């Protein structure tokens, strides 16, 4: 039962990571709004919240990596294998998105110092590209998994359904992440 128990736990690890990511995205959105209001014309607390959620997500990603390793090892039919791979896919998307979020945080902080880049751009582009491919690969795995269900009870179908909601939440998070990159690029243009 160690695989099935690990797969269930890994679903909760991923949800918790995505939740923590969501709070972090809201903080970067606040930061950008505040910056725009000053060029139109609390930061110590903002730093602390950024540092707290950054630490939290780091520890949640570490737990999810360690659980992934355990499940992949216990795995060694196609359904379970698909479910484990889809956990890996989602995890990779979260790791990638977190790095993009940390690049946006860096941008905010630079802009902030001047209201108190070529390499940045290149890294944003590289990770954005990566994330698009990981989302595409998760969508493909999700179709596959849904097809395997047609050909363990309601437990496995339930997990497949929740993985669809986790991917949906990653996609929504990417939509808003990409919006913060556009906002930081608009602010960058204005100071240059």
């Amino acid at each position, epitope marked *: 039962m160690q695989l099935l128990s690990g797969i269930v736990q890994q679903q909760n690890n991923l949800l918790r990571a995505i939740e923590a990511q969501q709070h972090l995205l809201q903080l970067t959105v606040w930061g950008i709004k505040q910056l725009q209001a000053r060029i139109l014309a609390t930061w110590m607390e903002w730093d602390r919240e950024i540092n707290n959620y950054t630490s939290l997500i780091h520890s949640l990603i570490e737990e999810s990596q360690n659980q992934q390793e355990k499940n992949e090892q216990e795995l060694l039919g196609q359904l379970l294998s698909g479910i484990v791979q889809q956990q890996n896919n989602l995890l990779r998307a979260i790791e990638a998105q977190q790095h993009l979020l940390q690049l946006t945080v860096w941008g905010i902080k630079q802009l902030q110092a001047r209201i108190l880049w070529m390499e940045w751009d290149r890294e944003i582009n590289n990770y954005t590209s990566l994330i698009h491919s990981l989302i595409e690969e998760s969508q493909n795995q999700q179709e596959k998994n849904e097809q395997e269900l047609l050909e363990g009870g309601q437990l496995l179908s339930g997990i497949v359904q929740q993985q669809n909601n986790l991917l949906r939440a990653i996609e929504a998070q990417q939509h808003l992440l990409q*919006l913060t990159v556009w906002g930081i*690029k608009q*602010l960058q243009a204005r100071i240059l």
Partner: antibody, heavy 117, light 108 residues
């Protein structure tokens, strides 16, 4: 989904402010672009705003003369073009820039602005 | 700013023919390139986003290709509704910029 204000006539040197009304959803997760097209000519990007931040960017040609604002309380975006000359006569479109697509998925119907005496 | 150049400016082809049009950026824009279709009297319509993805409501006879600085839109077999002006637009960096357009005309 994007409702624009009615056609306008202005004299040279005057200004015009055109509006684009969207939903709640648009203003909380999308960007708004303004794009114009003189009769028989091509599309020209004027600028854009991201309402949740208030950030904006303008094309080089209109720096100095264009202002884009958006007030979240009415989900309305506006484009104000100053020092109007006759070559500004065009259809002015608002467009919703979708960050999942990196493209414009919805357009308003366009607003005729005619600049003449 | 980033300059977009479309080629050719105009093109004639029979209904049923294949065509390719091209868009070139003055600097690398990765895959951040969209194509739009416009009929006279109408707003533009997104057909392709991120260089090669079909937008909702765009038929499979359309495809896009390319990366960096050189991009292409291909229609494998033209139907009456495809004769229109096509614009590219880069979404790599602000300010955003359109190509000059390619008008497609029916040959008879």
């Amino acid at each position: 989904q994007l409702v624009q204000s009615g056609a306008e006539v202005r004299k040279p040197g005057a200004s015009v402010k055109v509006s684009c009304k969207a939903s709640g959803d648009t203003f909380s997760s999308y960007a708004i672009s303004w794009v114009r097209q003189a009769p028989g000519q091509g599309l020209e990007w004027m600028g854009g705003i991201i309402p949740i931040f208030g950030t904006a960017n303008y094309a080089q040609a209109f720096q100095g003369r264009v202002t884009i604002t958006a007030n979240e309380s009415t989900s309305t975006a506006y484009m104000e073009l100053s020092s109007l000359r006759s070559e500004d006569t065009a259809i002015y479109y608002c467009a919703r820039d979708n960050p999942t697509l990196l493209g414009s998925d919805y357009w308003g119907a366009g607003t005729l602005v005619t600049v003449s005496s | 700013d980033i300059q977009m150049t479309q080629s050719p400016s105009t093109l004639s082809a029979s209904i049923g023919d294949r065509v390719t049009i091209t868009c070139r950026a003055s600097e690398g824009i990765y895959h951040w390139l969209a194509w739009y279709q416009q009929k006279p009297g109408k707003a533009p319509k997104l057909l392709i986003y991120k260089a090669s993805s079909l937008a909702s409501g765009a038929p499979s006879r359309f495809s896009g290709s390319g990366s960096g600085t050189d991009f292409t839109l291909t229609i494998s077999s033209l139907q009456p509704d495809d004769f229109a002006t096509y614009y590219c637009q880069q979404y790599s960096n602000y300010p955003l910029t359109f190509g000059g357009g390619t008008k497609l005309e029916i040959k008879r």
